[PDB]
Amino acid sequence: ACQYTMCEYPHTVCKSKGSIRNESWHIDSSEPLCLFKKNFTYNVSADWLY
Amino acid sequence: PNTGVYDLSGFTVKPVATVYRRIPNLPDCDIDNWLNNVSVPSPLNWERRIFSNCNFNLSTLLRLVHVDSFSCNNLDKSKIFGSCFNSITVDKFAIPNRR
Ligand SMILES: *[C@@H]1O[C@H](CO)[C@@H](O[C@@H]2O[C@H](CO)[C@@H](O)[C@H](O)[C@H]2NC(C)=O)[C@H](O)[C@H]1NC(C)=O
Ligand SMILES: *[C@@H]1O[C@H](CO)[C@@H](O[C@@H]2O[C@H](CO)[C@@H](O)[C@H](O)[C@H]2NC(C)=O)[C@H](O)[C@H]1NC(C)=O
Ligand SMILES: *[C@@H]1O[C@H](CO)[C@@H](O)[C@H](O)[C@H]1NC(C)=O
Ligand SMILES: *[C@@H]1O[C@H](CO)[C@@H](O)[C@H](O)[C@H]1NC(C)=O
């Protein structure tokens, strides 16, 4: 949860087979004010995620 | 007063001290994992890192690196321990002895 300089046409790109484009949803190389930051781990062999 | 049975509030307990627990949102900056780095730069090409959006204190810092002095300026040394700044920018280099 941050103050993200979000782009106009945001999208992502899978990192097993790289696409033509690149991940461009923010150009924010300024480390902006973040009210929250965290990382969690889940199952890679799971069917669904709720 | 008359004869009778009366109910009187006698003070019995009072809270001694408090317990405080809170889960942190942001992470530890680990300044001392940078100040104890091996490759120390010389006063021509000093480094700088910008520790921002994390949590820190001072006591584990200044006992985990072998301090010889800690002055301050435009500040009071106990005003660190409370407040919440916006970033910290540590710039280190080695010292030539006669200068
Ligand atoms: C959460 O996990 C991601 C991915 O594992 C971390 O992003 C990596 O951060 C390191 C150090 O900054 C970079 O060298 C990698 O290139 C990053 N990977 C990707 C895919 O971006 C991220 O730092 C983790 N966040 C926290 C708070 O630990
Ligand atoms: C001390 O600082 C240097 C930065 O000068 C850190 O060096 C990095 O080491 C990793 C090792 O995998 C390299 O991939 C990076 O490219 C290095 N960074 C740079 C800017 O060259 C070093 O890790 C620091 N020491 C500790 C203990 O964190
Ligand atoms: C994606 O980024 C790389 C590196 O900046 C660049 O070489 C490449 O041309 C970019 N792809 C597109 C479609 O612009
Ligand atoms: C979730 O992970 C466990 C081991 O961590 C594994 O036994 C289980 O098969 C995984 N779930 C699915 C749906 O595969």
Rg of chain A over CA atoms, rounded to whole Å, is: 14 Å
Our count of helices of chain A gives 0
Characterize the main sheet of chain A: none
Beta-strand segment tally of chain A: 0
Largest interface: A-B, 7 and 7 residues
What spatial form of chain A do the alpha-carbon principal axes imply?
flat
Q: List the bound ligands.
A: a molecule of 2 linked components (NAG-NAG), 2-acetamido-2-deoxy-beta-D-glucopyranose
Glycosylation sites (chain A): 22, 39, 43
Protein name (chain A): Spike protein S1
Disulfide bonds (chain A): 2-34
Organism (chain A): Human coronavirus HKU1 (isolate N2) (HCoV-HKU1)
What does this structure look like?
The structure is cut from a larger assembly and holds two copies of chain A. Chain A has no helix or strand. With 50 residues, chain A is low in regular secondary structure. Chains A and B meet through loops of A and loops of B. A molecule of 2 linked components (NAG-NAG) binds next to loops of chain B. Chain A: Glycans are attached at residues 22, 39, 43. Chain A: It comes from Human coronavirus HKU1 (isolate N2). Chain A: Attaches the virion to the cell membrane by interacting with host receptor, initiating the infection.
